[PDB]
Design a protein around this ligand. Structure first.
Ligand SMILES: CC(=O)N[C@@H]1[C@@H](O)[C@H](O[C@@H]2O[C@H](CO)[C@H](O)[C@H](O[C@]3(C(=O)O)C[C@H](O)[C@@H](NC(C)=O)[C@H]([C@H](O)[C@H](O)CO)O3)[C@H]2O)[C@@H](CO)O[C@H]1O
Ligand SMILES: CC(=O)N[C@@H]1[C@@H](O)[C@H](O[C@@H]2O[C@H](CO)[C@H](O)[C@H](O[C@]3(C(=O)O)C[C@H](O)[C@@H](NC(C)=O)[C@H]([C@H](O)[C@H](O)CO)O3)[C@H]2O)[C@@H](CO)O[C@H]1O
Ligand SMILES: CC(=O)N[C@@H]1[C@@H](O)[C@H](O[C@@H]2O[C@H](CO)[C@H](O)[C@H](O[C@]3(C(=O)O)C[C@H](O)[C@@H](NC(C)=O)[C@H]([C@H](O)[C@H](O)CO)O3)[C@H]2O)[C@@H](CO)O[C@H]1O
Lengths: 551, 551, 551
């Protein structure tokens, strides 16, 4: 039934595993959080712009332009989409070690045990004590967008998603969305003489969309005895593979046949002379077959233009880059490794004195990466031993500039390209993402493993209904209202399908394992353990431990 | 039943054609070979590396690096995948002339009439005669991988597939596969001062996969009376088109309307002045319509970076190139023509004194090729009669180098690109290939027309069970064993679906035809005929004789 | 049916996993070996004694006495009982990481493809070549003891079990058993004056048992077309736990309550003064409660007399010792760590030049160990700060001897004792063992995890039936016979029940993982990989990776 003094829900954060048959596992993850909600700092939708001239007013700073236009709303969203919400670290280990692939199934959400209190300040003076007491008749406004009418706004982008710690309360993210505005920002280099345009445009009758929660949604009013339940949402998605691929474009197919087995363990085997070797190559005019020049089924990974900034009406932005292995040469940006910035709630440690903590994720697929300094292009007709003019190296100055090299602007993507789909990032990463409404769609989104084919799971929006004092003028500019805050429990259930991996290999596979403290190894256990004062940290776990045969 | 002195199979190499209805033909190809098998030169799995410093130790030789790491196995594979196995030359003619498209259906395989003999050397001395006699109790080990657990290893890559001549015995290919290892090879040009790293890495706990036939498979033991039969495998593939496309990007759509018909056969027709011509173009600011500048539905073929070497962890390798027509300008590498190297068994001639024979296949689709020296890019705003600075030609030195030109690094592939699927190569070419296990897959593999969507046909592995002498120490390093070899018949049946072509054209179509000896024409008949001593040669037949309307 | 030239069996070494429901896994392990068998070096049962006086004739060498009495038999046994036979290393990893407990179910065995050959030496002289040819009518004698009438003789004790490598042939162990004889060996120390008895006794009419295979068994004669199959044997055993226990006797129960949480991460918490602390202790006369003196539910592990040699009629022998953790003080013998000696077939490496390889297994249960130097006994009435006479330390000379201390002779075993059951040793270790026929039985056998409650699986015995020349005198002392050897395939199927482990822990659990080469870590991958020449090694894997809560 429900009422004052009766709990409307239950607190379940534990995770379960059912084995449904051969190799098939149904993973059910319950997660629950206490959520703290403040009266919004304004009652009005607001259209605001940030234009930072201090940064962009002077040359070469283009990359730091923040200028944009957004709609600020009194509403706040509860966003459950990150991996760190749903699983505790060991669960991620257990899944990552034993399962070949995994897929989303369904999502449920509930809100219950709403509590709303009002603040009053008694004994005015040096003491200035605050008094807290329940308003039983106050309500909380709740809205879910099933039809995805509102702009879709993943909270993890800013790391505003619900915290990762079951026993720590968490806060919603205030809901906001971009608004169409035009920006002109000229391109300059350091200490260049000239003037920078650095302007923003007036509103566009064509492009302007202003949405209002109240007009687009059905809002449920929740008092204390009330509870809200989302229906069961079902994902339509492709499963993702949990095993990394080691197998490079030069490891494909049949190896050459050795002449004879080596005599000692230190010796190296020998091959038929490249002049006499049989095989298939696309090089013209030479009689040779070499492991490097032999034809392969397809291109694995591809060179990408990196630190590419392109400018449409909105301004400059960096082109995304498909995450790939940073090779032995370690260069991150060419292969587009991800770099996260996050706070204590999602990570870091309460021991840390820094405002944020930062981590750089490297792709775990050791095949498709590109090591640029060793890439080169050779002139035609092909020749052995090219001279300086017959080969283009990564040391070659492009357009007469020192630090720019063709690998910056070179794009090898083509019909023969094949690359692995990047991997989820356990504590911090976006589980699912909505697909763009464009006709021609990208092969994959960069940050999120899962993309909803038809309709994304809805966004859950909340605000406190305003409490008004005795004196209210509808025409007044300033609004006096009772100081009020509230708390409620958020609960959700996330079902996943996964399948155990086979092992055909003789040798032991690599695994995710804890390690003794006292060595600096990344897996040293204390990082997963509480401190004396209760400080705890949650750090990215490597994913896809087990190798797989690509071909 | 079976037993000593009873044949367990029959020898059928002939090909059949059923006409199932209108235009539909079911092609059934039987093929059989006598296979000679030697006792393996070692009993042990071996992990060996070839690292050739002599070639790579000195600068600019990067392209010839063979360095890799492989697992050597005592097992040998019987690989039936090439076109030259299944068909005799005339069959290929008959199919290639009359049929619009063709598709794989099913594959069967059998092993029968196993014969195993032992070798002993009598009368030791100058005579040193060898004696051959049957071991009736010896067995041959046979394993098929249906689940494709082992690394997939097409034998044609090295041209080790079963021979193309029904009456000549053939040998298996020894089975081997790559093993993960890291290589660092620096990039240098000729006579460059410096040092070359040229190193290889230690084994990787992450990436190491060592597979063993015995652990991954079910092995059947075959004595003389025994026979082995694979079940029927079914392909899921897309059919391939047997007719070439002539129609270039400038042949698409409606031609301009001529003013009037010419007066004489030598005269040329005239068109409405380009100033007054109606049409559609993407050039801004000019009032013109020209056959070159008019909009076309799509890009046919595309410029490709050619002699592109990219380096991942394994080392440098050449990026594959979609085969396209070499244009009148004949340049092969830009359009990525295939070049085969093969032996007498698969080709060449027993008359030849060379170790191998070589052939360069040119694409038969005359539309999508690119002739680079005539490609150019023009500055914006567009203008007629560009000056030297307003146009980028293929004579223009890129990065201040003589032999490198933008067409080397230029990549035009894009959403508007369309190209024909390359064509099978009759005597030597890979019929089917397994698809990579990556999430994002290439549009086509380069060498093989057919790609198995789900699960490739299994690989068939054989070895002789070891015969041990009286004295066997399990702990001894060296293994003494009876010299032994064996032979067996391999039989297979390959079913294909194909459809007769229509002919709507007035004029005669081109065909594949024999030609009298005494002229040097490529089709001169004697190349398909035996010699006096029995020497025979089998050479690539042109494919896709009949033209087709693309649009 | 069967016959010459028809294989009677199939070669399957692969392993399977079925998931039968929630958490339950049925593990089926097939294993197959080629077995090489020599004509026995004698046709007669022989009663032989080894009495080594050279070692025992001089004082203090008692520990090396080998003297005993055995019955030598022409028969040889095929013994499949070791872990290294049934699993490849990765399988052991996979099981050891994911499964809480495991139990035996059933065992099958088969013999097939018997091949028997005869040896003759042709061309007598410097060449002296050997000729090998089949004897089709020769037979091999096969006997299985289901009723366990013969003395039970695990082959792993001497490491004579079938090899661990599927692709390497292996040899049987010659069957033999002890025979009752009495030995008198006096006890002496180094350089002690006196005489050593060092005698052995005459046969005992009471105790003499001489068994003969032919009289106790049904022997099957196997020619080439013959095959032999054991029925399905079923184990009755208790499952064993795959998770180690960390929880010491001082970790049991509720911890004391701290006064307050510490201020900083470096600080230590404080407890209520031991004078005022509540609790339960068995110490009389003192008002205290200390973590060391508080009562615990039971004793975990116990002190054991170590290097204890006791002598019955047969001679001196070391008393077995329950394997327990060697503590930080590392002392192995007090806690009875196992030490294995094994050859290339079962281990070591073909790279090794030593005759054998040796490994010392440490218990993986970190609770029940004893660190002796820190054990002590304190006088009664109890007191704080004991003087020298009030405490017995491990530095205290017992019986006026330097190196003997009470922990040598001290035995703490009692009703309150509890200890974990030791763990299987993957490459080398005894899977099952037969229970002694005594009325009062040990709680556990030391080497073997599993003990058959009722009737052990039978022992499989083989020999070659003798081939006689033309001249045979039954009364002759020497027996001339045809040199003959044979080979056959052994196949077996071992079914196991196991259950997946839950994980409730926040932190990541420890796992068995491969590790990159180049660091000396025990798990460095290359030890599981073949060498260039095919040398391979198989080393003990740590077991029971995952911790468990004892109480
Ligand atoms: C390229 C090179 O060899 N540089 C060296 C190196 O010593 C160092 O690089 C940086 O060193 C400090 C930390 O020692 C930086 O903080 C960078 O590390 C951080 C980061 O900010 O990205 C912080 C911290 O070390 C790590 N952990 C956390 C919880 O923040 C993370 C994390 O491990 C990475 O994401 C892993 O990729 O990285 C680090 O790059 C420079 C000094 O700048 O000095 C050179 O000698
Ligand atoms: C570019 C040019 O005009 N070059 C000419 C030309 O005369 C010649 O080119 C090469 O000539 C010899 C043979 O005359 C080479 O052997 C090349 O031909 C081969 C090859 O090795 O690729 C061998 C042989 O002629 C052909 N047949 C067989 C069975 O091997 C094959 C085959 O026809 C090709 O694959 C067809 O594309 O080609 C040939 O390229 C050079 C000398 O190098 O001299 C210039 O004047
Ligand atoms: C007690 C102490 O600190 N002793 C050290 C130590 O350096 C060393 O102890 C012995 O060292 C050699 C090898 O370095 C011995 O061979 C012993 O190791 C062996 C063994 O024989 O038991 C051999 C080898 O190192 C290991 N592996 C194999 C495949 O044989 C095995 C195995 O790791 C053990 O079973 C693990 O417990 O151990 C080793 O005890 C002595 C020299 O005797 O020197 C002192 O400084």
């Amino acid at each position: 039934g429900g009422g004052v003094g009766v709990s409307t829900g239950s607190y379940d954060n534990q995770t379960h595993y059912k084995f449904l048959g051969d190799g098939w596992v149904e993973i059910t993850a319950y997660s629950t959080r206490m959520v703290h909600l403040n009266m919004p700092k304004s009652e009005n939708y607001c259209r605001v712009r940030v234009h930072n001239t201090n940064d962009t007013g002077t040359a070469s700073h283009m990359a730091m332009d923040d200028a944009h236009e957004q709609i600020w709303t009194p509403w706040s969203l509860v966003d459950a989409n990150a991996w760190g919400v749903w699983f505790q670290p060991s669960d991620w280990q257990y899944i990552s070690n034993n399962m070949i692939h995994i897929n989303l199934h369904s999502l449920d959400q509930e809100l219950f045990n709403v509590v709303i209190k009002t603040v009053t300040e008694q004994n005015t003076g040096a003491e200035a004590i605050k008094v807290y007491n329940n308003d039983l008749t106050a309500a909380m406004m709740v809205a879910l967008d099933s039809n995805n009418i509102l702009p879709y706004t993943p909270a993890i982008d800013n790391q505003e998603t619900l915290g990762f710690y079951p026993w720590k309360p968490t806060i919603p993210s205030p809901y906001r969305y971009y608004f169409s505005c035009d920006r002109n920002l000229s391109v300059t280099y350091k200490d260049e003489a000239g003037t920078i345009t650095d302007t923003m445009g007036l509103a566009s009758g064509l492009n302007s969309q202003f949405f209002t929660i109240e007009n687009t949604q059905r809002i449920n009013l929740l008092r204390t005895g009330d509870e809200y339940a989302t229906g069961t949402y079902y994902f339509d998605t492709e499963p993702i593979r949990l095993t990394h691929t080691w197998q490079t474009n030069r490891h494909l197919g049949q190896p050459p046949q050795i002449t004879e087995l080596p005599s000692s363990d230190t010796a190296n085997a020998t091959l038929t002379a490249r002049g006499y070797r049989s095989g298939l190559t696309q090089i013209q005019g030479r009689n040779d077959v070499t492991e490097a020049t032999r034809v392969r089924p397809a291109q694995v990974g591809f060179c990408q233009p990196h630190d590419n900034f392109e400018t449409s009406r909105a301004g400059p932005f960096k082109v995304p880059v498909v995450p790939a292995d940073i090779t032995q040469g370690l260069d991150h940006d060419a292969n587009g490794s991800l770099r996260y910035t996050y706070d204590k709630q999602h990570g870091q440690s309460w021991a840390s004195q820094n405002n944020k903590d930062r981590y750089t994720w490297d792709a775990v697929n050791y095949d498709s990466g590109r090591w640029t300094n060793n890439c080169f292009i050779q002139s035609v007709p092909f020749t052995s031993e090219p001279n300086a003019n017959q080969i283009l190296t990564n040391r070659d100055n492009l357009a007469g500039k020192t630090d720019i090299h063709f690998t910056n602007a070179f794009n090898s993507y083509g019909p023969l390209t094949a690359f692995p789909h990047p991997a989820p990032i356990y504590p911090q990463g976006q589980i699912w993402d909505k697909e763009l409404d464009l006709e021609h769609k990208p092969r994959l989104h960069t940050q999120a493993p899962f993309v909803c084919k038809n309709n994304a799971p809805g966004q859950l929006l909340v605000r406190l209904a305003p409490n008004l004092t005795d004196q209210y003028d509808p025409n007044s500019s300033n609004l006096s209202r009772i100081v009020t805050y509230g708390t409620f429990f958020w609960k959700g259930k996330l079902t996943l399908k996964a399948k155990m991996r086979p092992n055909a290999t003789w040798n032991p596979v690599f695994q995710i394992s804890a390690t003794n403290q006292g060595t600096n190894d990344y897996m040293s256990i204390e990082r997963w353990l509480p401190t004396a004062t209760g400080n705890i940290t949650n750090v990215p776990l490597l994913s896809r431990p087990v190798a797989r045969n690509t071909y």
